[PDB]
Amino acid sequence: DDWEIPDGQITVGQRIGSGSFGTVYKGKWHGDVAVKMLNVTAPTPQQLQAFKNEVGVLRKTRHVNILLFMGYSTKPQLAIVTQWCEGSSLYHHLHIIETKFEMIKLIDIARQTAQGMDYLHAKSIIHRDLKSNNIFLHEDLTVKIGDFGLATVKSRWSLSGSILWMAPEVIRMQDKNPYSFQSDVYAFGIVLYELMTGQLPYSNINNRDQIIFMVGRGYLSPDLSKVRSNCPKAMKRLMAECLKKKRDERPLFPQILASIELLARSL
Ligand SMILES: CCCS(=O)(=O)Nc1ccc(F)c(N(C)c2ccc3ncn(C)c(=O)c3c2)c1F
């Protein structure tokens, strides 16, 4: 009935995670776990009921490509415990350790992430923050998507680091709720660009606000020409489809997924 891990059962160890939202530690609870201790004062409802409501979102997910929610902690503090992933994140592989993936593997990472996304969308979950930092490469073979949890915690107790993945309608903080299925798709288009170019977009602009203004007004978009010349002829078009400026013109993941598997049977 309950996934509440009682006080003293978990063993928080070496610190790895940082930033806002929360702090991420490697733990030990029935083996190596990940614990995301969202450092927030000491609630007290609504907060308690709000945390438990966000946890109930995570419980809806059971998929090889979605990070395994293992349990949550309220007692020693508020926290989410998931499986620990062996290996690095996609962002780290591509942009730090500079790992050069074989073209079939790159297509596979893409296929898998799209797969994981298709699932979330089916279970009526909008990620709201798909980026290569959040795509974990487990045992260097399985794609695990994470950080989709909370976001109500992000709004009820409160946006400066995911710029590159943000779709136009999101970038320009316009109508109250810009987040959609298609919003996640553009973000996917960006991670596709990351995969196919091994680069972050807009590296030749040094002014972040300028990126923000232009992307949001659709004057500037990712440079599709930079994809390596051994890239499939039809991968470039799928990427362009996902990155459409108007959100109405973007595919959904069932369709996206079909295109990857179609071009997969071409290598
Ligand atoms: C499944 C519910 C979605 S959620 O609750 O929104 N995301 C979520 C929850 C707890 C975490 F520790 C991590 N991360 C951040 C995490 C997890 C495992 C990791 N394993 C290894 N390494 C090196 C990590 O950095 C690492 C980070 C998450 F992304």
Question: Is residue 229 within a helix (H) or strand (E), and if so which, with residue range?
Answer: none
What ligand 1 atom has the least distance to the C-alpha of 82? 10
Q: Is the CB of 17 under 6 A from ligand 1?
A: yes
Residue 180 φ then ψ, to 5°: -145, 180
In DSSP terms, which residues pair with 144 in a beta bridge? 136
> Cα–Cα–Cα angle for 208, 212, 215, nearest 5°?
125
Question: For 51-68, b where at least 16 C-beta lie within 10 A, e where not — what string?
Answer: bbebbebbeebebebbbb
- Whether residue 147 has its Cβ less than 6 Å from ligand 1: yes
C-alpha 19/C-alpha 33 separation (Å) is 20
Q: Does domain 1-86 have CATH number 3.30.200.20?
A: yes
Method used to obtain the model:
X-ray
- Residue owning the nearest CA to atom 8 of ligand 1: 147
- On the 0-12 / 13-18 / 19+ scale of CB atoms within 10 A, 103 is middle
The response to whether 17 counts as a known ligand-binding position is yes
Mind giving me the DSSP string for 99-166?
----HHHHHHHHHHHHHHHHHHHHTT---S---GGGEEEETTTEEEE---S-SHHHHHT---S-GGG-
Catalytic residue among 129, 140, 175, 184: 129
> Which atom of ligand 1 is closest in space to residue 81's alpha carbon?
10
* Arch. (CATH architecture) of 87-267: Orthogonal Bundle (1.10)
Q: Decide if 248 is catalytic.
A: no
CB 135 within 8 A of CB 143: yes
How far apart are the two ends of the chain, measured CA to CA in Å?
47
Resolution (A): 3.4
Domain ranges of the chain: 1-86, 87-267
Query: Which atom in ligand 1 lies closest to the alpha carbon of residue 147?
Result: 6
Radius of gyration of the chain (CA): 19
Domain 1-86 matches domain 87-267 at the CATH topology level: no
CB-CB neighbours of 98 under 10 Å: 9
In sequence order, what DSSP letters do the residues of the chain get, joined into one string?
A: ---B--TTSS---SB---SSS-EEEEEESSSEEEEEE---S---SSHHHHHHHHHHHHTT---TTB--EEEEE-SSS-EEEEEPPSS-BHHHHHHTS-----HHHHHHHHHHHHHHHHHHHHTT---S---GGGEEEETTTEEEE---S-SHHHHHT---S-GGG--HHHHTT-SS----HHHHHHHHHHHHHHHHHSS-TTTT---HHHHHHHHHTTS----GGGS-TTS-TTHHHHHHHHT-SSGGGPPPHHHHHHHHHHHHTT-
- Residue 259 is labelled as binding a ligand: no
Ligand 1 centroid, distance to 30 Cα (angstroms): 17
